[PDB]
Every structure is written in structure tokens, then in C-alpha cells.
């Protein structure tokens, strides 16, 4: 049930603390009680070095349902990003984050985030979540890359 | 429609380039039908043609993967080899073509390979490898062979297969790994292999690493990966390969290999030191992850092998190097945070050992932990005031979370070092004070703060010494100011047992109370000390009350902290003689009763409301903590204030915010006074009835329920409450009729009140002014509300209501007259209209009807189940008769009734 999820999230936290990619950040939020909330994490993914995303730090929220880890968590960029697989709400469209597609209860938080970071540089064309970005990526790649570099600069650290 | 290359290709164009979402979604859904169609086995190969652009080509490749992965039964066994061949050809074709189509065709081939084993394809790896060594240049064929070998494992991981089927595939797959690794080793040891091939090789290695292949088979590749850490281009991949290889669940099965890895880890020390020297954070971060991965995950296993203790100890020091890496976290480095969990593990492992292992290992690591303490306090130290300014909001937050993590680490280091850690702190602080950046002093105190609550009270003679040093610190910064206050608060419980030291810490707290920039920390600490030492703080009560009154008068604290301070005083006064409580209560309230009065005679304003509310809040917060029982100064104060209270109600009887602040003052009073509150009952009921009429609120019902419970036994004082009970019900019932589902909270409280009445004052239902039929109607409808709280409360009412059958005439008539209605609602809930979470609740209503209304229950159930499809369409006539026979048993333990409902509610739902 809910307890099963909470225990597994405590484990994910311990593993993330000891082993996680340079530049990434994944942290649980605190309840109004001041208590720690494992169902809602505040993360930030850095753009892959060597790509137009390089330099940017993109914040996203990870939300867990009480059936975790049976059902994958919902990931959402705050604010929404210019990107083919990212819905305007901010939700990320990724096959491993779909319970009926690839999500395996075994997938870790390090894997999810790395999977999202990869998806940034490489849009999956099998599923459109944003009409314009997804169109510009297929129709005119030069404009796509131009905007993405602007976005990367927009989310540069200060 | 009809799936042809022409039509499928037109749809791809629409999805890819038609800007309009509607269309795209159409094209997507049409393509989803086309990808699974039988025509895919025909048009997918056509979409691979050179004229189709890459993206369009991908759909063809992807559709091929779907048909093999999804419709394997569409292929005959004689066509396996031919199909096999067609895909190898296509992969060779695209080794020089588009990269996306290559991968996609590789996944397709891997799906077919897996479907084939173990028997249909004896040596999937051998065949693949042999064919690529054989049109294309070496690099293109090699990268393609690796792409295929890399995706193979990844497809297995997603292959949804049967325990039986999957085992056979996994088994053959572990055998196939015997051909994969050799190849990978070759490519790395060949100086002719290009950087791009090296990267794919590491990536390939990590893929099979997820399959949990024995750590020993990896020695050759793990050693090569370590060596690749030298090459900047390969760093990322090998760090990930090494960490994953060492982090495998069963990697602990091969302890020997692990020992052999330690030296490979220590060999990185030079590279690590250099990265620190150059400031390259990405690198130290990676090497640290590798070191932490080995030592953190196999600490006890490596400690078990005592003969190698020296090797492990070097590893521990390397980690110590990363924990203390030069610079500030996380601006200058982000590595130290990776090592904190490690120090917990190491310590835990040593305490686990017994006898010689524990004692000898303790002699080895006790000095290592003292060194750590020194390192942790330097890292918990703040950067210079100037440098800190340049930190972003985020960087500051990461350092706050980082300090919290160090506090937990220090709390464990305490359990490893014992009281000698405390003495160590005393010497460091003492030395700094007499032998001077606030940062350095603040960190040392922070050390004490993180350990303060965990300290046993047994080895606390050193603690007094430390308390003494606090009053000698130069509080030059707000950060140091809070730490000092928090430390004092942390020692709150310790002070309650050692009252002499109060004298030393209190002056500091009372002085901080006058500085608004230190409002939150000072008031919380005062509250803690006031809660813990009230019995030893009676002598100082006079000074505390004075400094609190002054501070309030100067608007030094924000409303929320004004309330904390009042709670603090509640505690403090609860410990003084009644005569003293009275002298101070007036000192505290007199100066506000005046402001309230100016305010009561004032014409209502937005600013007028905030002020009136804040003052009432002070009172209710004061009376929450002021329980003299566990004269009546509070009673007198109440009677005196009541006169003013009423004045306020006249102009604000219609304010939601105000009508409740007043309610709160009586709620907290009644909880503190309880029975002694008896004088006020009469006045309070009159005031509550008017309050409730004007503006109904759950809070009022809750206080009414508190009253009924408290004065249910003494008939002397109860008459006024009876009046209030009836009034409140009349009003609630009528408000319920307008929009029953608009006030879940009021309905909830109303149900609780009603149940409380049934439990403690049953006769109340005999009142002629009471509408028993309407109440029963309200409770039955409430059971169907969305909110669990509201339903539980309704169930609770019926639980109490039924046992009163035959005891009170009115309750007997209603259950006989409208009880069928209740039962039907209960079966609707069990049938599925209620959360499964509430089943136990509804079962209670059934048990109650079985025990008290059996003759009626027996009759009602038979009528209510006669209709087919109710309570559920899934229920068979036989099933219904099985349940009714089980429920109509005259003897049953309530524990069994819940079971019957559980079993039944599952059938109704599936």
C-alpha cells in the first residue's frame, strides 16, 4: 500500500545520496507538518555537455502515487519547456514513465532522471506532446536548435 | 483506412509537419492502427527505401519491431531464417544510413533473437559477431554490432514474459554473455580502436551489467574501464559502468573480486587530488562515486576479511579525503555530500561485530572518527559574508540541506565516540574563545546543536561546562544568534533535570526576545524551556512575564510568534500559586482588554478585524497551555472578559473569521477548565446559540459536543446545554435541506455530536422539540457522501443509535419506520458505492442491526436482495442467499461480520 511506497522511496533517497550524476539534484519536499515528504521531490536536470542544452539547469517535479513502485511517478518540468515530448502542462512524455509501456518497478530515480536528460537532447518522434516544438524539430531543425540554445541560456545558473 | 506505403506515408507527413494538434492526433491514431495491421509486414520494409526521409524510415523500422515483438505468431517457423537474414541485411544497409533507423532495426532483430532462444537460435551472439567481421567500413560495422549487442539486454528487460518462459530466456542469455564480453575486451585492448568505439563498448558493458552477470566475469572489463578513466572522452561512460558493476544486487556474492577492486580504487587517488587542484568538480565527483560505491555497499563484507584490513583502511581515508575536499559546498565542490551515508555504515558495521572484532576495529577507527568530526565542522562552516552574497537562492538551500545531513552524521558519530566527543567539543570551543569569525564559532556550536538532543543524561557532566561557554560568545551575526538559541532549545529537556544551569541560559533567551530579527528562534526556545522547566522556573516567572509583556508592547514579534509566546506563558503560569497566576494574568490581559474595548466600540473595518482577531488569539493561545488542574483565575478572567466578548459579537456576529476566534477562546478554555468551567456554561450556551444561528460552523458543534460530554453526568448544570443541543440541531437540519452536500465538515461534526448525545445522554432524544425522523434522514444521506470523515461519522451515529432500541421510544419508532432505508443505503455502499476503506464501518451497522434489530434485519434483508442486479449486477442469486444466510446468523463475533462484508464487497466489485 502507501507504506510499501514510502519505504521504497526512503531507499531511493539513500541510494541517490551516495550515487548520482554530477550536476543533478533530487530532493524530497517538506510537509506543512515540517515532516519530510517522499511523495513529492524537487529535482533539476543539467543539459548534456556537448549539446545545445549545455549550460542550462532545468527544474522538474517528481510526484509519486501510493502504488509506487508498481506505477511509475509523474514527472513535470516547472516551468514547462520548449520540447517535443513535453506537454504544455510540463508533464514529460517518456516510455519508461508509462505503466503500460516500459516502467518496471525496479527502475530507480537515477535512471528516470538520466532517461529524461537523454530525452532532452533526443526527442522521441513516436509521440508529440507539443505541436510547435514537435513540428519545428521535424520541419526546420536549424530553428529548433536556435530556440533550444536560447532556452538553455534562459535557465543558466545565476 | 487501407494501409499502403502511399497512405501511411501521407499520414506521417501530416503528423510530422501539419502544425495543427487535432490533425496530428488523428494521424497518430491512424498510424497506431497501421503499425499493428497485417499490412505492416508489407509496408514497413517499403518505408525503409532511400527516397523516404529518415523520420518516415523510422516508422517503417519501428513498425517492424512491433510486428515481431507483438505478432510473432504471424510468422511461420520455416520463415525464421529468411526473416533473420532480411534484418541483418537491413542493419548493414543502415550502418551507413540514419542512426535512428539503425537502432530501431537493431531492437527488432533483438526481439526476434530472444523469441527464438533457447532452441530456435543456439548461438545468437556468435552468429551476430561473426557476420559483422565479414560492404561497410570497419568502424560502421563495429558500432552497428555494438548497437545490436547493447539493445539485446534492454529488450529482454522490457520483454513481458512468463516466469517459465523468462527463465529459459534469461538462462540462455547468461550463456550468450560469454561471447559478448570477450569481444568487448578485445576492442578496448586494441590500440586501433577509436574513441567512439570505446564509448559504445563501455555502454554495451553497462547494459549487460544490468542483467546481473557475476561480478567475477567483469574483472577484465572493470579493470579496462578503470584505465579508461584517464581519457577525458571516456570518463562519463566508465564511471557509470564501474558504479553499476559494483552496485549490482548480487555483486556481494563475489567478495574476492571486490578485494581486487580496492587497489584499482586507490590508484585513482592521484587523479582525484589533481582534479581538486585544478578545480574540476565533475571529475572528483565521479571518482568519489566509485569509491563510495565500493566502500558503502560492501563495508561489512570487506571488514569481515580481516587479513586485508589495511587495504580497506586506505579506502576509508580516500573517502575521508572526499568528505573533506577543499572548498565550500556546493559552490566549490559537490563531492562531500556523496560520502555522508558512508560514515553511518562504517560505524554501524563496527558496533555489529562482537568481542575482538569490535574491540580491535574500534581501536582502528576511533581516531578516524575524531578526524571526521574535525572535517565535518569545517565543512558545516559558512563562507565569508562577502562570498555568501554571490550565492544563488538554490546554492544556499543545498548548503542548508547539506548541513542537516551533517547533523545526522554527527548524531551517529556521537554514538561511536561517546562522551569523549563532547569533551572534544568543549576543548575546541573553549580554545577558540580564549586563545574569530562568527562562522568558525557558529560551526562548533552547530556541532553541539546537532548532538544536543541525542545526549544521554548519564555522561552529561561535560554538558554543564559547555553551557557555561555559550554566555562568553560574541554574537556578531544573525546566523550565530539563531544557532545559540536553537542549541539552548535543544538542551531544554536536559535543563529540566539540571535546574541550576537555567540561570545561565535564560538571560540570553530573554535578551534575544527584544530583537525582531531573532523572533522565531528566541520564542521557540522560550516555549521549549517553559514547557520543560515550568516546575523549576517558578522563581523566574516574574522576570519572564515582565520581559514578555514589554516585548509585546513594542510590536517586536509577528502575530504567529505572539501566539507562541502566549503558549509559553501558559506553561510558565500553570506552575505558580493561584494568587500569583491572578496577579500575572491581569498584568497580561489588562493592557489588551483596553485595546479590545476601544476596538469593540469602533466601527468594523478590515484593519479593525485583524486587530480584534489577533487579541482574541492571544487569549485562546494563553488558555491552551494554562491548565491549572493538570479561585479559578481563568474563570474570573472569563467572566470579566465575557462582558467585552459579547460587545464584540454584536458588531461581528456575522464575521466568519471573528465568530470562530471567539469560539476558539471557549474551546481551549473548556479543555483546560473542564468541569470547573461550570459557571460559564449558562452564559456560553446563550452566546453559542446566537453564534450558530447567525453563522453556522463545525467548530460550534464541536464545542457543544465537548459540553455534552463534560456535563452529561451532573443534571444541575446540564439544563442550559440541552437547550443549546436542540437549537443547534434545528439550525443544522434546516441548513442541510438547502444543499446537503455543501458542508461536509458541519455534517461530520453534527454526526459526532448526535452520537455523543446517544452515548452519554440518551433521553435527550425524547425531547419534543427534537425531529428524530429528520436526524435519521440526514444520517442516512450522509453515508453516501464522498468524504470518508463524514461517512465514518455517520456510521458512528448509527452504531450508537441502534443499541438504544427499546430503551428510548423515539429511536425505536424511527428504526422500525425508516430502517429499511438505512439498510438499503448500507447494501449500496457494500455493493460498491463506498470506498473499500469504509467497509469495516458499514459492517458495524450490520452487526448492530443483527444484535438489536434481528427480527427487522431478517425481514429487511430478504426484501432488499430479492431484486436482481442489486446490490450488484455481478451477484448471482446463490451468492445473495449465501450472504443473507451468513448475516442472519443470531450468534456472530463482530470480528466475523467484517469478514463477511469483506468477502461480499469483493464479489460485488470483482
Curated annotation (Swiss-Prot), chain A:
PROSITE patterns assigned: UBC_1, UBC_2
Site for Substrate binding, residues: 100-101
Cross-link Glycyl lysine isopeptide (Lys-Gly) (interchain with G-Cter in SUMO2) mapped to chain: 18, 48-49, 101
Residues modified to N6-acetyllysine: 65
Swiss-Prot/TrEMBL keywords: Acetylation, ATP-binding, Cell cycle, Cell division, Chromosome partition, Cytoplasm, Host-virus interaction, Isopeptide bond, Mitosis, Nucleotide-binding, Nucleus, Phosphoprotein, Transferase, Ubl conjugation, Ubl conjugation pathway
Effect listed in the UniProt record for changing residue 61 to A: Slightly impairs binding to RANBP2
Variant or mutagenesis effect after changing residue 93 to S: Loss of enhancement of sumoylation by RWDD3. No effect on RWDD3 protein levels
SUPFAM superfamilies per UniProt: UBC-like
UniProt cross-references to InterPro entries, sorted A to Z: Ub_conjugating_enzyme, UBQ-conjugat_E2_core, UBQ-conjugating_AS, UBQ-conjugating_enzyme/RWD
Annotated effect of mutating residue 25 to A: Impairs binding to RANBP2
EC number: 2.3.2.-
Main location: nucleus
Tissue: Expressed in heart, skeletal muscle, pancreas, kidney, liver, lung, placenta and brain. Also expressed in testis and thymus.
Subunit: Forms a complex with SENP6 and UBE2I in response to UV irradiation. Forms a tight complex with RANGAP1 and RANBP2. Identified in a complex with SUMO2 and UBE2I, where one ZNF451 interacts with one UBE2I and two SUMO2 chains, one bound to the UBE2I active site and the other to another region of the same UBE2I molecule. Interacts with SETX. Interacts with HIPK1 and HIPK2. Interacts with PPM1J. Interacts with RASD2. Interacts with TCF3. Interacts with NR2C1; the interaction promotes its sumoylation. Interacts with SIAH1. Interacts with PARP. (Microbial infection) Interacts with human herpesvirus 6 IE2.
UniProt-listed PANTHER family: UBIQUITIN-CONJUGATING ENZYME E2 (PTHR24067)
Assigned protein family: Belongs to the ubiquitin-conjugating enzyme family.
Protein name, as recorded: SUMO-conjugating enzyme UBC9
Organism: Homo sapiens (Human)
Curated annotation (Swiss-Prot), chain B:
SMART domains found in the cross-reference section: IBN_N
Tagged with keyword Repeat: yes
Tissue specificity: Expressed in fetal brain, heart, intestine and kidney.
Record's keyword terms, sorted: Cytoplasm, Nucleus, Protein transport, Repeat, Transport
Main location: cytoplasm
Record-annotated Importin N-terminal domain positions: 27-93
Gene Ontology CC entries for this record: cytoplasm; nucleus
HEAT-type repeats, residues: 6-36, 38-70, 77-117, 124-158, 173-210, 215-247, 255-304, 309-351, 354-417, 419-451, 462-497, 499-533, 537-575, 578-623, 633-673, 677-711, 718-760, 772-802, 817-850, 854-888
InterPro entries per record: ARM-like, ARM-type_fold, Exportin-1/Importin-b-like, Importin-beta_N, Importin_beta-like_NTR, Importin_rep_1, Importin_rep_2, Importin_rep_3
Subcellular location: Cytoplasm; Nucleus
Disulfide bond entries: none
Biological process, per Gene Ontology: protein import into nucleus
Molecular function as annotated in GO: small GTPase binding
Protein family membership: Belongs to the importin beta family.
Function: Functions in nuclear protein import as nuclear transport receptor. Serves as receptor for nuclear localization signals (NLS) in cargo substrates. Is thought to mediate docking of the importin/substrate complex to the nuclear pore complex (NPC) through binding to nucleoporin and the complex is subsequently translocated through the pore by an energy requiring, Ran-dependent mechanism. At the nucleoplasmic side of the NPC, Ran binds to the importin, the importin/substrate complex dissociates and importin is re-exported from the nucleus to the cytoplasm where GTP hydrolysis releases Ran.
Subunit (UniProt): Interacts with UBC9, RAN, RBM8A, eIF-1A and PAX6.
The protein's name in its UniProt record: Importin-13
Organism of origin: Homo sapiens
Name of the gene this protein is made from: IPO13
Amino acid at each position: 500500500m502507501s507504506g510499501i511506497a514510502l519505504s521504497r522511496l526512503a531507499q531511493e533517497r539513500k541510494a541517490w545520496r551516495k550515487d548520482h550524476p554530477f550536476g543533478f539534484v533530487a530532493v524530497p519536499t517538506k510537509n506543512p507538518d515540517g515532516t519530510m515528504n517522499l511523495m513529492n521531490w524537487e529535482c533539476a536536470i543539467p543539459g548534456k555537455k556537448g549539446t545545445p542544452w549545455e549550460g542550462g539547469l532545468f527544474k522538474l517535479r517528481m510526484l509519486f502515487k501510493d502504488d509506487y513502485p508498481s506505477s511509475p511517478p509523474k514527472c513535470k518540468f516547472e516551468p514547462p519547456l520548449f520540447h517535443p515530448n513535453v506537454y504544455p502542462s510540463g508533464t514529460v512524455c517518456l516510455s519508461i514513465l508509462e505503466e503500460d509501456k516500459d516502467w518496471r518497478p525496479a527502475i530507480t530515480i537515477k535512471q528516470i532522471l538520466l532517461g529524461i536528460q537523454e530525452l532532452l537532447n533526443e526527442p522521441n518522434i513516436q509521440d508529440p506532446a507539443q505541436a510547435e516544438a514537435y513540428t519545428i524539430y521535424c520541419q526546420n531543425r536549424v530553428e529548433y536548435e536556435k530556440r533550444v540554445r536560447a532556452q538553455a541560456k534562459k535557465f543558466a545558473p545565476s | 483506412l487501407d494501409f499502403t506505403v502511399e497512405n501511411v506515408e501521407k499520414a506521417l507527413h501530416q503528423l510530422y509537419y501539419d502544425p495543427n494538434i487535432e490533425n496530428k492526433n488523428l494521424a497518430q491514431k491512424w498510424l497506431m492502427q497501421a503499425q499493428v495491421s497485417p499490412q505492416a509486414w508489407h509496408f514497413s520494409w517499403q518505408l525503409l527505401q532511400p527516397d523516404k526521409v529518415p523520420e518516415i524510415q523510422y516508422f517503417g523500422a519501428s513498425a517492424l519491431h512491433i510486428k515481431i515483438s507483438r505478432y510473432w505468431s504471424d510468422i511461420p517457423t520455416d520463415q525464421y531464417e529468411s526473416l533473420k537474414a532480411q534484418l541483418f541485411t537491413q542493419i548493414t544497409r543502415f550502418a551507413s544510413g540514419s542512426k535512428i533507423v539503425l537502432t530501431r532495426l537493431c531492437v527488432a532483430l533483438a526481439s526476434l533473437a530472444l523469441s527464438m532462444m533457447p532452441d530456435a537460435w543456439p548461438c545468437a551472439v556468435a552468429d551476430m559477431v561473426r557476420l559483422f567481421q565479414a560492404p561497410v567500413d570497419g568502424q560502421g560495422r563495429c558500432l552497428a554490432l555494438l548497437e545490436l549487442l547493447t539493445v539485446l539486454p534492454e529488450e529482454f528487460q522490457t520483454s513481458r514474459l512468463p516466469q517459465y518462459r523468462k527463465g529459459l530466456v534469461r538462462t540462455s542469455l547468461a550463456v550468450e554473455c560469454g561471447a559478448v564480453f570477450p569481444l568487448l575486451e578485445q576492442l578496448l585492448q586494441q590500440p586501433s580502436s577509436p574513441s567512439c568505439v570505446r564509448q559504445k563498448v563501455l555502454k554495451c558493458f553497462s547494459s549487460w551489467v544490468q542483467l546481473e552477470v557475476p561480478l567475477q566475469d567483469c574483472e577484465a572489463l572493470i579493470q579496462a574501464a578503470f584505465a579508461a578513466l584517464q581519457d577525458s572522452e571516456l570518463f562519463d561512460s566508465s564511471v557509470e559502468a564501474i558504479v553499476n558493476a559494483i552496485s549490482q544486487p548480487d555483486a556481494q556474492r563475489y567478495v574476492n573480486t571486490l578485494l581486487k577492486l580496492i587497489p584499482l580504487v586507490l590508484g585513482l587517488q592521484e587523479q582525484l587530488r589533481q582534479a581538486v587542484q585544478n578545480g574540476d568538480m565533475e571529475t572528483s565527483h565521479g571518482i568519489c562515486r566509485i569509491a563510495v560505491a565500493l566502500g558503502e555497499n560492501h563495508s561489512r563484507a570487506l571488514l569481515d576479511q580481516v587479513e586485508h584490513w589495511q587495504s580497506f583502511l586506505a579506502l576509508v581515508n580516500m573517502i575521508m579525503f572526499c568528505t573533506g575536499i577543499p572548498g565550500h559546498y556546493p559552490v566549490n565542490e559537490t563531492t562531500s555530500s556523496l560520502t555522508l551515508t558512508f560514515w553511518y555504515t562504517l560505524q554501524d558495521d563496527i558496533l555489529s561485530f562482537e568481542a575482538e572484532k569490535q574491540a580491535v576495529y574500534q581501536q582502528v577507527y576511533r581516531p578516524v572518527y575524531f578526524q571526521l568530526v574535525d572535517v565535518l565542522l569545517h565543512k558545516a562552516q559558512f563562507p565569508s559574508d562577502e562570498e555568501y552574497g554571490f550565492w544563488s537562492s538554490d546554492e544556499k538551500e543545498q548548503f542548508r540541506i547539506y548541513r542537516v545531513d551533517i547533523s545526522d552524521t554527527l548524531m551517529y558519530v556521537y554514538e561511536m565516540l561517546g562522551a569523549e566527543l563532547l569533551s572534544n567539543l568543549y576543548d575546541k570551543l573553549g580554545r577558540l574563545l580564549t586563545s574569530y569569525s562568527w562562522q568558525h564559532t557558529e560551526a562548533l556550536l552547530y556541532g553541539f546543536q546537532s548532538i544536543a538532543e541525542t545526549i544521554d543524561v548519564n555522561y552529561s557532566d561535560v554538558v554543564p561546562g559547555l553551557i557555561g561557554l555559550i554566555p562568553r560568545i560574541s554574537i556578531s551575526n544573525v546566523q550565530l544568534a539563531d544557532t545559540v538559541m536553537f542549541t539552548i532549545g535543544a538542551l531544554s529537556e536536559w535543563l529540566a533535570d539540571h535546574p541550576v544551569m537555567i540561570n545561565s541560559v535564560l538571560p540570553l533567551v530573554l535578551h534575544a526576545l527584544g530583537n525582531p530579527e531573532l523572533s522565531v528562534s528566541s520564542v521557540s526556545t522560550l516555549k521549549k524551556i517553559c514547557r520543560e522547566c515550568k516546575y523549576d522556573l517558578p522563581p523566574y516567572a516574574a522576570n519572564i512575564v515582565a520581559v514578555s509583556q514589554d516585548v509585546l508592547m513594542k510590536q517586536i514579534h509577528k502575530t504567529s510568534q505572539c501566539m507562541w509566546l502566549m503558549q509559553a506563558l501558559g506553561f510558565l503560569l500553570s506552575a505558580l500559586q493561584v494568587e500569583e497566576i491572578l496577579k500575572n494574568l491581569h498584568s497580561l490581559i489588562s493592557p489588551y482588554i483596553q485595546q479590545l474595548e476601544k476596538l469593540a466600540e469602533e466601527i468594523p473595518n478590515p484593519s479593525n478585524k485583524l486587530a480584534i482577531v489577533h487579541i482574541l488569539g492571544l487569549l485562546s493561545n494563553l488558555f491552551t497551555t494554562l491548565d491549572i488542574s493538570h479561585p479559578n483565575p481563568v474563570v474570573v478572567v472569563l467572566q470579566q472578559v465575557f462582558q467585552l466578548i459579547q460587545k464584540v459579537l454584536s458588531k461581528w456576529l456575522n464575521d466568519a473569521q471573528v465568530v470562530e476566534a471567539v469560539c476558539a477562546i471557549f474551546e481551549k478554555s473548556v479543555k483546560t477548565l473542564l468541569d470547573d468551567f461550570a459557571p460559564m456554561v449558562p452564559q456560553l450556551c446563550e452566546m453559542l446559540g446566537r453564534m450558530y444561528s447567525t453563522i453556522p460552523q463545525a467548530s460550534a458543534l464541536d464545542l457543544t459536543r465537548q459540553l455534552v460530554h463534560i456535563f452529561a453526568h451532573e443534571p444541575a448544570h446540564f439544563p442550559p446545554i440541552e437547550a443549546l443541543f436542540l437549537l443547534v440541531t434545528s439550525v443544522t437540519l434546516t441548513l442541510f435541506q438547502q444543499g446537503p452536500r455543501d458542508h461536509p465538515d458541519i455534517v461530520d461534526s453534527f454526526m459526532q455530536l448526535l452520537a455523543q448525545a446517544l452515548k452519554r445522554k440518551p433521553d435527550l432524544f425524547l425531547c419534543e422539540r427534537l425531529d428524530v425522523k429528520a436526524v435519521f434522514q440526514c444520517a442516512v444521506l450522509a453515508l453516501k457522501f464522498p468524504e470518508a470523515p463524514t461517512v465514518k461519522a455517520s456510521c458512528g451515529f448509527f452504531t450508537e443509535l441502534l443499541p438504544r432500541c427499546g430503551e428510548v421510544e423515539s429511536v425505536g419508532k424511527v428504526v422500525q419506520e425508516d430502517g429499511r432505508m438505512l439498510l438499503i443505503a448500507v447494501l449500496e455502499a457494500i455493493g460498491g458505492q463506498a470506498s473499500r476503506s469504509l467497509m469495516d464501518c458499514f459492517a458495524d451497522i450490520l452487526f448492530a442491526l443483527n444484535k438489536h434489530c434481528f427480527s427487522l434485519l431478517s425481514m429487511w434483508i430478504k426484501e432488499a436482495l430479492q431484486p436482481p442486479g442489486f446490490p450488484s449486477a455481478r451477484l448471482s442469486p446463490e451468492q445473495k442467499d449465501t450472504f443473507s444466510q451468513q448475516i442472519l446468523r443470531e450468534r456472530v463475533n463482530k470480528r466475523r461480520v467484517k469478514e463477511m462484508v469483506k468477502e461480499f464487497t469483493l464479489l460485488c466489485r470483482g
